[PDB]
Design a binder for this molecule. Structure first.
Ligand code: K
Ligand code: K
Ligand code: MG
Ligand code: MG
Ligand code: MG
Ligand code: MG
Ligand code: MG
Ligand code: MG
Ligand code: MG
Ligand code: MG
Ligand code: MG
Lengths: 81, 140, 23, 48, 214, 129, 181
RNA sequence: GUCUGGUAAUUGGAAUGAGUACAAUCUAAAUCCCUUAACGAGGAUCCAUUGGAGGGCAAGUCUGGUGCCAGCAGCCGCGGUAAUUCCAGCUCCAAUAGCGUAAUUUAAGUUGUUGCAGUUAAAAAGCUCGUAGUUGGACCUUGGGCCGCGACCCCGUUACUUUGAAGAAAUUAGAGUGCUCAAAGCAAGCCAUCGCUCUGGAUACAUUAGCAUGGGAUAACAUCAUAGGA
RNA sequence: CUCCGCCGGCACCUUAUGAGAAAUCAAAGUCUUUGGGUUCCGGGGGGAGUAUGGUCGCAAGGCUGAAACUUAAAGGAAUUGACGGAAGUGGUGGAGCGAUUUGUCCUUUGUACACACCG
């Protein structure tokens, strides 16, 4: 939220679940953040990675595995990983 | 569920009209039985002290409440009126004008006094508070 | 008092009131 | 019941005259005193 | 003085954190109250109520005391603590620690034109605990807090100036009344609004940020 | 029986969005549901939707983007003048900053802000935010 | 019929819903002591006036910025708030009217402005000075301390010409004392 | 120590209106107000009260008396010898020239249209049919560009909505205006003017029903293969 | 007989992402982010399904159905304890809205008792 003067008025901008787009609250302790490392040719790990955060709701449902696998297929396609 | 149709205004209004009679306050107001009460819808009434009586309090408490038996002048109805303010029964005598009021719970009995919803407020034209505080004297 | 027996008692008083007022 | 004891305690209570004390300021000045006491200076009536 | 027993406590002790919103971004559980004191210094503290609870025993009744404590900096952070103990003083002391441990961010918005600083709830928000349901409606600037005494205190510590409230249920149950209000304040950074439609950038968590220190 | 197909469409979409589903099928289809969906898409609350012709009442497959908090109908479709839009938005919308009330007007099916812009009243279909 | 029956009158204040709340009592007493008020009703009527002004401002904020009533009545309200010193020049919007407090209205009283102008040693001395007819606004003496002073009238608050503190003759106490001497 | 605050029937001079009253003014005549000579404050007796002090609910687990009595107590309760609750004194608290006590609104989402309930708290008819009532699936002129937000091009009703005219005044909301303020009133203002500002004396709201204008999405009714059409 | 499906039916098990005062419920969910349609029906506890009127019935009774008056609770779910003429102590963490509970593996069970069955 921006003020009409042009300042941010929110304490913070919370993360959104990468699968359900739900806002990940500060006390959502079932939420996680996965960093999937990037590998170049020969299999060496570059040191860069992509990040996905899943809300506690999607993990509690059990769809976290399938959601994460679909998200990773998409980004891997896009970045050639 | 409850009716929701745009053309069901009559149903809703009639149902509310019929159900308002279940509310105790509504039915007390719109039954007309409050005109059969001793006061007949008035805040205060005058009456004749018939006899001074003492009626026992409820079970937990042990006291003689020392009320008064009053015959109203507007309708001739006999009621029991409580006399507050310790010692004020001696200001009450038989065949003496008294102004009664409600005991504060709208015809419901108050406190440990059973069957009494009326208090004496004024005797012989002088308020009981003035006689208690000795601000005025009872005329002879 | 049991509600069934209360109802039976009340049916008996009503029988009596009916046989008195009607007859 | 027995009406003979009406006025018992209030008649038994010994009469104690009120002390002739100074009057407190009345109106705006009284509010000034209260404001001073509770803002520029246990409950208000603690038996200290 | 303080030996941190958690990884988060170690970083807070060293000074890797400056504000409590870095913890909020990653939804990390806060298990040491010294973290909240270090990162949220302007915290006040008020005991809302003390309640005697009795456990029937063979020989009479075992009475413990339940203390409800609300903390907050009046600038978007509020916390509620409930501790039951055999002594009132330790019940209050335990509830203050719990209240600090539950310090949550509170989102504040504008009833109308976004002029000045936020003063109200961004949107209608509701909290429920037991039979108590607490609704908060955004209010124009200058309205103040139109609420019962129990939710007014929590709103004052949250930093909310103007709000309309409505409650249903047994709000006489003060534990539920205060918990429902706190839940209502918590669910305020959780309503997705078009201003939060921008995709998250996923900054590094402090665990992986300071694995060299830890 | 099916009394309001719009209600079933919006309630199914709401349940699917709450469930985290990325696609919801709507049956039956209707012009009012496609017109409500176009308003929803214009304000960015849904993505692609596809009308499937089955030589009957159609089917709609809608892409969901997680931006929906709630969408519902108002039944009955109360008459709403331009002046009562403020009261209706106060009743149904989370704030004066976000949310939309969908109206059926003789000028077309539209959100309440667009209804104010043309000063056209009508009847309330529903809401989404 | 009596023609006097058609004269209007109305109430200027309400009593609080909760009579015995510690926080409200403390805040009211703090304001009363800060501004030398005679009772809580003087603050309650200021709160009543602020409530009506705030309600008017809120009702025009819930209308379009092109609604000719909001352009007209908001301009009138802003003129009235600027006229009595309640709003600054940068505060030229209806939003700032909603932010006004009873402190802003109490600061425009003749008692407060007489005290802050240096004419009186205290707020209570200002109150008595006004009630003793020693204060004039412009050429008009004002014995009413709740007088709301306009910005154009602030620089004309002065001691009365008939008052011993404003060039007039000595009061009866001083004159009696010199006659005794 | 100095600086700055609150306290004293201390000590001092200042101030002033309540009152009294020349007078003028007011007024049909009077009277009140406004104005004003003289007078008019120290314990400034020129003396503020009404309710309270267990909780709700602000304020005492001070003192004396009474002892389940007398009494208080809206409700919960208090009173049997240590009464924070009665009767009193002191002190404190709230409002304050006011405050207490004895139908209606709010509180009450405890009448619920917005907005309540009905497994077990009160509440689904034993079950089914069925008239009225209420509610009723989808479908029919859309796109498109041009000019330029209007337009262009390729003798069935009604609800509803929009705009207009009405819907007395007073009341309400609200513009202006320093009745000393204010509740008001509809006045007034102007360097002083044999006059002037054409001075002002706005505006909004006003269900339902009626009249008229545009719109036809939604919906109701009437039709709806002897069209036997023209 | 066996296996895999589809539709429909009586049900059952697990689980909460839900709801609920909880018990519990896959509906008792999709509810202050409150509106799919419709019928009946409740408004503290008694008096009272009583009186009276009406109607149906041979009768028994059924349907409809008060008031005066009285009362500060009645009632629901769950917890701990006690009882049964029933059977065989913190901390921190976890669960619960919570009283509580786990830890501590006399127990289980019923309770309208909690002055606790001498109720
Ligand atoms: K089956
Ligand atoms: K434990
Ligand atoms: Mg208190
Ligand atoms: Mg006393
Ligand atoms: Mg209810
Ligand atoms: Mg039962
Ligand atoms: Mg039942
Ligand atoms: Mg249809
Ligand atoms: Mg509802
Ligand atoms: Mg009942
Ligand atoms: Mg624990």
């Amino acid at each position: 939220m921006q003020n009409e003067v042009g300042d941010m008025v929110d304490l913070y901008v919370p993360r959104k679940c990468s699968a359900t787009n739900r806002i990940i609250t500060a006390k959502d302790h079932a939420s996680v953040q996965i960093n999937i490392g990037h590998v170049d040719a020969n299999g060496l790990y570059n040191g860069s990675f992509t990040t996905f955060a899943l809300s506690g709701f999607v993990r509690a449902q059990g769809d976290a595995d399938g959601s994460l696998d679909r998200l990773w297929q998409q980004k891997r396609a896009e970045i050639k990983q | 569920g409850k009716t929701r149709g745009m053309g069901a205004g009559r149903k809703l209004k009639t149902h509310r009209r019929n159900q308002r009679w279940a509310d105790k306050a509504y039915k007390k107001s719109h039954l007309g039985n409050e005109w059969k009460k001793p006061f007949a819808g008035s805040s205060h009434a005058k009456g004749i002290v018939l006899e001074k009586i003492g009626i026992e309090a409820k079970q937990p408490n042990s006291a003689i409440r020392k009320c008064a038996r009053v015959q109203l002048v507007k309708n001739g109805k006999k009621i029991a009126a409580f006399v507050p303010n310790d010692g004020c029964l001696n200001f009450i005598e038989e065949n003496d004008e008294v102004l009664i009021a409600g005991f504060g719970r709208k015809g419901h009995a108050v406190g440990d006094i059973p069957g009494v919803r009326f208090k004496v407020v004024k005797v012989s034209g002088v308020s009981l508070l003035a006689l208690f505080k000795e601000k005025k004297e009872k005329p002879r | 008092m049991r509600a069934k027996w209360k109802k039976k008692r009340m049916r008996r008083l009503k029988r009596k009131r009916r046989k008195m007022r009607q007859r | 019941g027995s009406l003979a004891r009406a006025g018992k305690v209030r008649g038994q209570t010994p009469k104690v005259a009120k002390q002739d004390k100074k009057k407190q300021p009345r109106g705006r000045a009284h509010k000034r005193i209260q404001y001073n006491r509770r803002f520029v200076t246990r409950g208000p009536n603690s038996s200290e | 003085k303080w030996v941190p027993v958690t990884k988060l406590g170690r970083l807070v002790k060293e000074g890797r954190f400056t504000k409590m919103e870095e913890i909020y971004l990653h939804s990390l559980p806060v298990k040491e109250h010294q973290i909240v004191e270090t990162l949220c210094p302007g915290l006040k503290d008020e005991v809302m109520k003390i309640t005697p609870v009795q456990k029937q025993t063979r020989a009479g009744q075992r009475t413990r005391f339940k203390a409800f404590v609300v903390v907050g900096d009046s600038n978007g952070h509020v916390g509620l603590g409930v501790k039951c103990a055999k002594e009132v003083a330790t019940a209050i002391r335990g509830a203050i620690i719990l209240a600090k441990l539950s310090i949550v961010p509170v989102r504040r918005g504008y009833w109308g034109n976004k002029i000045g600083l936020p003063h109200t709830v961004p949107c209608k928000v509701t909290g429920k605990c037991g039979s108590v349901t607490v609704r908060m409606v955004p209010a124009p600037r200058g309205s103040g807090i139109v609420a019962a005494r129990v939710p007014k205190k929590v709103l004052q510590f949250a930093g909310i100036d103007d709000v309309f409230t409505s409650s249903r249920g047994s709000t006489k149950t003060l534990g539920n009344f205060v918990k429902a209000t706190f839940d209502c304040l918590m669910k305020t950074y959780g309503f997705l609004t078009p201003d939060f439609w921008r995709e998250t950038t996923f900054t590094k968590a402090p665990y992986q940020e300071f694995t060299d220190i830890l | 029986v099916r009394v309001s197909v719009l209600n079933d469409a919006l309630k199914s979409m709401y349940n699917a969005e709450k469930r985290g589903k990325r696609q919801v099928m709507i049956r039956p289809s209707s012009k009012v549901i496609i017109k409500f969906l176009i308003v929803m898409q214009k304000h960015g609350y849904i993505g692609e939707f596809e009308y499937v012709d089955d030589h009957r009442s159609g089917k709609i497959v809608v892409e969901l983007n997680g931006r929906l908090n709630k969408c519902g109908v108002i039944s009955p479709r109360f008459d709403v003048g331009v002046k009562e839009i403020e009261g209706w938005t106060a009743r149904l919308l989370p704030s004066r900053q976000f949310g939309y009330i969908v109206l059926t007007t003789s000028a077309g099916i539209m959100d309440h802000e667009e209804a104010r812009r043309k000063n056209v009243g009508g009847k309330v279909l529903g809401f989404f935010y | 019929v009596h023609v006097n029956f058609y004269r209007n009158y109305g109430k200027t204040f309400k009593k609080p819903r909760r009579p015995y709340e510690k926080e409200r009592l403390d805040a009211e007493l703090k304001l009363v002591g800060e501004y030398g008020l005679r009772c809580k009703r003087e603050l309650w009527r200021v709160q009543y006036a602020l409530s009506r002004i705030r309600n008017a401002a809120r009702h025009l904020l819930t209308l379009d910025e092109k609604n000719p009533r909001r352009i007209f009545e908001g301009a009138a309200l802003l003129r009235r708030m600027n006229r009595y010193g309640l709003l600054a020049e940068g505060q030229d919007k209806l939003d700032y009217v909603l932010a006004l407090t009873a402190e802003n209205f109490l600061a425009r009283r003749l008692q407060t402005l007489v005290f802050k102008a240096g004419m009186a040693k205290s707020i209570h001395h200002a109150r008595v000075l006004i009630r003793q007819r020693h204060i004039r606004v412009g050429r008009q003496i004002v014995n009413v301390p709740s007088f709301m002073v306009r910005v154009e009238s602030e620089k004309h608050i002065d001691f009365s010409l008939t008052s011993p503190f404003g060039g007039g003759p000595a009061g009866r106490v001083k004159r009696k004392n010199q006659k005794k001497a």
